[PDB]
């Protein structure tokens, strides 16, 4: 599909521990539907490289669904981005 408007995301459920060593989150999108979600994460101070290990394959906002995202992050101080919506994520070491 087309790329979801980076300015039209809000947190329905902010990033949180899943209980099975992943990070889960849910967003509400307010642009055209359906669309394909740009999601990424950066190690603080290094915005060039996406450190997110996405488990959710091809995350997509559907007309009546979508917005759940599951990922894994390297230890340290990270920032998660869904479009331009952001949330800090400290990832505990192994």
């Amino acid at each position: 599909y087309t790329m979801c408007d980076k300015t039209k995301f809000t947190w329905k459920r902010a990033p949180t521990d899943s209980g099975h060593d992943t990070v889960v989150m849910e967003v509400t999108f307010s642009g055209t539907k359906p669309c394909r979600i740009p999601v990424r994460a950066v190690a603080h101070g290094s915005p060039d490289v996406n450190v997110a290990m996405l488990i959710t394959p091809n995350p997509t906002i559907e007309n009546n669904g979508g917005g759940f995202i599951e990922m894994q992050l390297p230890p340290g101080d990270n920032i998660i981005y869904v479009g331009e919506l952001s949330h800090q994520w400290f990832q505990k070491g192994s």
Partner: antibody
Amino acid sequence: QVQLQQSGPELVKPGASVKMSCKASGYTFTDYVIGWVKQRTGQGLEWIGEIYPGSGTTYYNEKFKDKATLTADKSSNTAYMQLSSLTSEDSAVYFCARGEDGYYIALDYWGQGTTVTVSS
Amino acid sequence: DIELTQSPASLSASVGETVTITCRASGNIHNYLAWYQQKQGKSPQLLVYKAQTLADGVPSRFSGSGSGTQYSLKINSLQPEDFGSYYCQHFWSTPPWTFGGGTKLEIK
């Protein structure tokens, strides 16, 4: 050049419904949002809602969800707003305006407005 | 919802002078603030988007600034066509895309 041509003024009874149109020309219709804005005489602007003509996706201001219905016709490059159960609080100028689908951060051209007057 | 509070409500100035009006957001809108001008009995005209970018055709005496929740529109060297009402609007994250209450700029 980009033009949004709106339909003519309506003078109607309380309880009637009106359907107004916004015909787009000068661009590709389905690449742009059409939003709708209300303005009472001497007062400010209020966002009613918007439609993405390419996908049919709509968004409504909670205050207008039982009042406005937004539709679009790709073949005629036209957006429509229907207002139901009109009261004197609905008397206002209604604008349509254009935003960019996929990076919607402004209403960048505006129609000339359609005046709806509810009267006895 | 995000509320936009515009200030001053009205002001009177003379051609050639400088004026500044502001729009305060109740929450972070990430600079996604648009400014419009509307003259008496006319349609609003886009002046500024993303808080500092002038729209096509807008002369350089207009300038937008601001961030977080406080934004400013500055008009240098006022011209007769600059008079009217000015509105701000935000497009961050989730509707409603609310407008500020408007500022009325009129001749002295």
